[PDB]
Amino acid sequence: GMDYQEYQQFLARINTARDACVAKDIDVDLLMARHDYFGRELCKSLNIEYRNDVPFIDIILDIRPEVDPLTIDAPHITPDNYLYINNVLYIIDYKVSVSNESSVITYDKYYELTRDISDRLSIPIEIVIIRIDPVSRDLHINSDRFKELYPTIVVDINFNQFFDLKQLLYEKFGDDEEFLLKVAHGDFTLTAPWCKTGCPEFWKHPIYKEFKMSMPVPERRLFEESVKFNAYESERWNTNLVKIREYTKKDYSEHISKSAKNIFLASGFYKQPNKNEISEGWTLMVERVQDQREISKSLHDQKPSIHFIWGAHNPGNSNNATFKLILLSKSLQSIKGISTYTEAFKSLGKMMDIGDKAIEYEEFCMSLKSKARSSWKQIMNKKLEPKQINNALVLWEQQFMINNDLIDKSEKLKLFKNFCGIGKHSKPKILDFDDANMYLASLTMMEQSKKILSKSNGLKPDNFILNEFGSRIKDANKETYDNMHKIFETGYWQCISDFSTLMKNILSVSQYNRHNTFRIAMCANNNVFAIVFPSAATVVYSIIVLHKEEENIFNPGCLHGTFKCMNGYISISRAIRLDKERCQRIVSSPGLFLTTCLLFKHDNPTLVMSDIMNFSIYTSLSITKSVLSLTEPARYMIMNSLAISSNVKDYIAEKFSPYTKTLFSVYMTRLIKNACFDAYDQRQRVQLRDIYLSDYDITQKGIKDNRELTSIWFPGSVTLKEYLTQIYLPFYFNAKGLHEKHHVMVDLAKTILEIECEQRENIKEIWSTNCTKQTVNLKILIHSLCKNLLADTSRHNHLRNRIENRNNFRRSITTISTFTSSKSCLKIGDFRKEKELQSVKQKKILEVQSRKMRLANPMFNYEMLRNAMPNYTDYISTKVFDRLYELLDKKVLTDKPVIEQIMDMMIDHKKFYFTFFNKGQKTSKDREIFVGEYEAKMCMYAVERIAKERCKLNPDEMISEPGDGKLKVLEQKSEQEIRFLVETTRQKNREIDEAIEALASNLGKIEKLSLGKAKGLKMEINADMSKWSAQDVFYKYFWLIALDPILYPQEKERILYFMCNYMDKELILPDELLFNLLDQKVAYQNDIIATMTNQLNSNTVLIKRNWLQGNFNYTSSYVHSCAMSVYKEILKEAITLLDGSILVNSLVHSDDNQTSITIVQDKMENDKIIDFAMKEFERACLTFGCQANMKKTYVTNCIKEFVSLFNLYGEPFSIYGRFLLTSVGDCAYIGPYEDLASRISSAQTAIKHGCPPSLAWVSIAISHWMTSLTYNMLPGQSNDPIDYFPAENRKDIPIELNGVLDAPLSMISTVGLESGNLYFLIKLLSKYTPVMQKRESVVNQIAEVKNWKVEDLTDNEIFRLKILRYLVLDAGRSILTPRKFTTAGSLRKLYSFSKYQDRLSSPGGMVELFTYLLEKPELLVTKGEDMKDYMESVIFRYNSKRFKESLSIQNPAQLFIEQILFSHKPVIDFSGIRDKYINLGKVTFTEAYRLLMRDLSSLELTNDDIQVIYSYIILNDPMMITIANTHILSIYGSPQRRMGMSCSTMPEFRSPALVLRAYSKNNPDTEMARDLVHLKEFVENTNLEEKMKVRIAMNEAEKGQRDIVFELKEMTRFYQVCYEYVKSTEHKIKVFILPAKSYTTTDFCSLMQGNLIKDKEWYTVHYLKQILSGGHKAINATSEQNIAFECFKLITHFADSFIDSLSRSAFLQLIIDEFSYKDVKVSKLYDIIKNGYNRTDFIPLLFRTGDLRQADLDKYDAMKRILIRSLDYLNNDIFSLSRIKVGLDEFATIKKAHFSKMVSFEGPPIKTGLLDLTELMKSQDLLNLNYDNIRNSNLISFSKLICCEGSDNINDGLEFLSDDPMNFTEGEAIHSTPIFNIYYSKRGERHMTYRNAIKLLIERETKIFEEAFTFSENGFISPENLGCLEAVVSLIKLLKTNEWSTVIDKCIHICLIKNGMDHMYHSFDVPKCFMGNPITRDINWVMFREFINSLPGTDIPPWNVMTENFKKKCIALINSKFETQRDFSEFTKLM
RNA sequence: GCUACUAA
């Protein structure tokens, strides 16, 4: 990026400097260094000459020197650069800054002065100031004339390297306040106050009394003093803040020492995990569980592991519906024996008989299905009636009627009372997992499963996934394709998939399942069936299977019993009562399952594939809560047990509680138990990779991947990365929303009331010194607040200004999202009236639904609560957008500034109320959400937001960093430590290491000195705080508001009052919880809920110290940061004692914490400091009121846990798996494209977090599978659109119609779904383009499109383009989307929806809205900027029936079934499809394909229509421009192993609602005026201004009068398509893990491309031309130049690196003339360099050719006193093209380029004795700049570099190679606790030249070739063998020159030239033996043939296989020559 | 609950 020379000198100046005024100048010099750097590279980007601080009076003299500068008055300014074209002078003053505030100042200053001579000379002078952003990198130019000149400018600039120097300078001097004084943009500017008057009540409040009670009396007054302090009044802002700092400095200075001095007190005794410590924990766990749960040893109490019973399919019987129905009927009737429900199952088969009348079932059912398939809506009013067939009364296809005559009254009861459990109505029941005869039973269940499921399907291993994605999986990694087959083949896959396909059909049936009906559900298996019994939503089902022989059935613990029938055996499973939410997951279980297996097995050959799948079905299908209780606690139980410092005992003895209800759970528990002990013995089995560090980051970082560790869930060995996956991944198998709300509300309530009681009874004291639970070290707090509050205001002065802007404090409440959102909200008051009326309605609807059930199968309160509970404070649920509307209409909210309204609300609202609703997430331990009043939301907003922008300043806080941005931060901080550790070790041990190499004589004396030295120590505290919210003093936060400098006194009074009320805040127990406790039935022994509510009197309990979970994150997080800031100071004083160095780095995120400590020792042992660090860690937490959970907290020597994002020893790594398990049931079930959109987004996310392409593609397959399974769009399904459309396969069917996503992953990762459309257009620009222009930019290939011929194209090719233009372009672009008939639902709670009723009811008032909205069309798309505007927007919104539904929650489970059932019904309205073709009702999916073709065939494809596609898609979006370029200019290079992974940021490829108001009326309300100009162009170029008006203007003559509906609906479309153009998208933080650091776009592109090709090897990427094009106005000049630079940089270095010094000019001269780099002649590139204005870059090149003149030297010398003859003399002994002396010791620079580019050279061969330097250029292996790599290289690699034309003495011929020394890589151990070797590049000695390397290679490798090709006991001598050699090398020329043969020839050649036998080799033709007659050149193939067989061969590596293949090839080939398949008639003609 | 008619 930047120059290396200036970096080194600026780094040294930071250490050299001591005083702040010296450090000041280093910051000033760094600005100019960046200033010129931007200018140097931009001048080449614009092709102009570079200049610096050139006077304006001289700039005119270049244009017109006839008038002298004295008489003509020119403005005396100092511009940077100038240009004169088109009779206009353009003045340049480039500058790099974040804001244009510094640019407009210099703009108007220049514009004013330049006008003095602008009218004097009558030549207009334009000011062109170019500014670039130093982080986001965006170009900003003010000149409009300059915009039209340069359409696109190349800006791949690097500031990343500049900020590295800034970090160093603001580290040493950043602590000193003398340096902070010098950096200022106003010193300190405090903005306008948010309030006018203070708060008197705050000083009176009893909580403020209680605050000062505990506090000491000097502190009491200080708090008074601090609040009343105004920062704007006193001379400086830090008057008070420093004053209170200096008071507490007595106790602080002492307490910092106190903690630090404990380093000597410590011992080598810390909570370390050990086999016994784990064992002890388990035993106390057993005791706990055996009390807390009812332990059972009986095998009848178990629950099903899986809720399914699979049995082998029967191919002998027919696979057809009607047949199976009767088959199961007779089968069920035929059941023989006696049980409980035997005669019940018997009659059920009897009630589904058809027999003779099989054909009547085929018709009757098809009529009913056809009746429903006609209508969009369901068939209402008409009564469904059954038809008597044999004994059964069929109601629908596979639906029957329960006939009360066919079953006994007693036998009907048995089935429903006992078996189905309809009418059945104290510890939990669990299985003893410590019983070996229970663990046995559990193991035998697995042994049983493996015995049956391992057996193959025997059916074709070809399903949609493999059929359509197999190709794209296989090419990524062939292993995974096979792995997939291995699964699909095995009964495992058929078992799950048939349960999936069966459940889909169980749900589909269960929807219309009545109370007098039992339904039958069949699957792809013709033995497996299911019976769905009447449900009293709840699905009641049994799996009924007809397995072959007895016990050829899989029972996981689900089966009721097997039964013998009259033909075979039939088994019926226990009645399962599951919920649709659970069942859904079972349907998507195969996708979950495949991923599980593939992820585990991936690239690990030691694992048993049949054992992975054996475990996987029991996970992917496990829907019980038994499993979650294992999967979650395991993650910590393993990691704790393999960490260094960690408390396992306590975690296993308290936090671990198995709920082993099922039988898999028992087996899985013991898998975990065992895995805990294996960890302890593997702690030291972890190794640390050899770190190849050579300045600016490291490649080959992180942990060593060694397969020495042991797996957890199955047998085999595993890698660390894989071990971690096996540890953490299990938890993501867990299922969401399993927690029954009835139980959650109780346990959530109980906990809050338990911890509040704790505080009420036990915790009384607030502050303390000894450090105790819920206590803060008040003196230490106040100081550490003061110190940080200073540094978080000194580093940014406008801090109060930044808060106002970024959080919209000044603007009206109606603008901020958090307030105008559709989130849940709590309303307080009295609703006893409507709450009673809303309840009794449902209590009647209860009886309504019961009355109807009494007729068919006779099986069978809010008033009470209010009457019973006296002190019941009444509340209600509402919406956040609705509350705002309510508070405005009743006028308490206004257009007053939101903060100004907040301040008043803090003092107005005095009592705060909060309610909780459960999340019920995948975790077994349930999480609560506290949601209270809207009034509260406003208060917390300010307090939290003020802390937000404060927290952002501190780099330690990470809640500030949105998205997965933390991952890179982990890395950047880990790398800083790995570097520091090395740097510091080399700085101390250098004195000792010198003596070691000196003596190494006797080695017995060396060990004495090698012991007594410095010792490295790294450690990471992977923390997790205990009860961050509940067990935390809220009183401490009062001080943060008090001490605050950027808060006014009248604000400070008001903030603290609200917080004073947030102590007397009440928790409302929601009614649903109170209803559970309403019906007593004997109360709880010790009822905590009743205790706190006084035997249930009030529904409110007061919560004090427990500030509610998530309400004060940032606030608490700043105090956390302040706490860890102390921990730093503690250790940093402790390590100065021992005399060494320490680097502590703390990452803070509310409750999740990570703190990395790196120490270089001298005195005491490493293990002492380990215990010391942990002591002060808890101390640091507890001195601030927070307590650290030592249970979950673990410490490693590498690993970093932080928010579950993991960084290893530099190498960042997340659990790629967790995101692949999302693409299964994560969608809103809207449409085929709409579903896939989010399912592929989940796959895109995996790639970010370092996922292999092979597995990435799997998710893409699964996603498609589920997507197509939802709407019956799979191959062979109903809506299968391959026959309906013209196409070969689903790759060619548009993804809008649902097909497959045919694109490269490197595109899908970037854009996705749209990629599939983009690839179909790039395919064309690689088919329908000529030989010229195709190799050039994409832009050029788009110009040729309008010169194509339409007739050339094919049916499919035409088909895409027609939809792509007439449909896709304008309409998340979908065409097919099913519409529903859903109802609005109950919207009574809403106030705002009532005001729509009143405006709809009263006549005229409706139209009045729409007529008002037409004069303000800004309020159709965006919400109002003012009260009325926002309010009336809310009412209009209700117009949409979709927005009315949006505020109601539909179950995705129910939504899923509704898209299956409504697929054969008319759902897609064609009206909205045909409208576009023209500019009936709903249409069925099948008909939608037909009716699309009837319209499509009519449309016309032109040479223009196609050119609109290539404009609107490619040429419009600068991103799509580059993506297409990257895939056309792509040149994939060297395949390499993924050694070093690094984090990389996604690059850039680039007023809202107020602008649209200035479009409605052209007058705005200055910068916003300029924004409308480009908006005018957008609407005029597309011409959508007229197109919209014409569409309305001709509709009023179509309809008749004035339709207000069309007046708006068409006007809204016009404003919504504006929104996307006007309101710009925020470039959110996206981090991709790549094989190296991506600085700029091009770098990112190359590394991204190469990461998503193969799994085993990543590839480095090249490009012919620049890929970064900006549009279709910008059509090469800037793409050419850089090629010339690359070329000559490459050549000069290749020449001075490898070619002999003596003959380097000749080489260059030969290369320049007859050669070409990247299809451009090197001469033309040289001419481009010579005609350029940066010749100073290529001084040594120009001198060597004789194209260097004095002007260049004079310029070069002026950039950073010379003569030509001086150079001519000086460089008489320096022979290099990359370097010439331009002084006494100053050499010239050529700037080295990478050597992976030399392949892009194409010229005639240059032969040098024997070597062909062209082939050395074209070589891959022999281009490394490492001596050892080339010395220890293969002869196969070198054998390409030989021609020799009969040379001699190989030693002589190698004279044309560099006899200059090469660079070797040396490595050394670092002497850390995690001991690793650093490897770096040295310069070797002298005898390490390129020649000697080649020679040593030749010698070593030829010796091995000789002994392999002896074929006798002689050698490479003895003509008896030379004859054999001649024979073997003869055939090689008379056969076929493939690739294997030629190598042998050239190797033999080499070997014979070496031995001095190259005076005959060239005169070696076929011997006399083989040649019958010498003259008559006849060949005896038979002889030759038998000669090849008669060759013995050798088995020495590496030639053993080489020779073997050669022989076979040559034999086969020879035999081929003979074998000529002649025509049968041919010979019959000749003779 | 969603639907169709009757009734206050």
Ligand SMILES: [Zn+2]
């Ligand atoms: Zn030769």
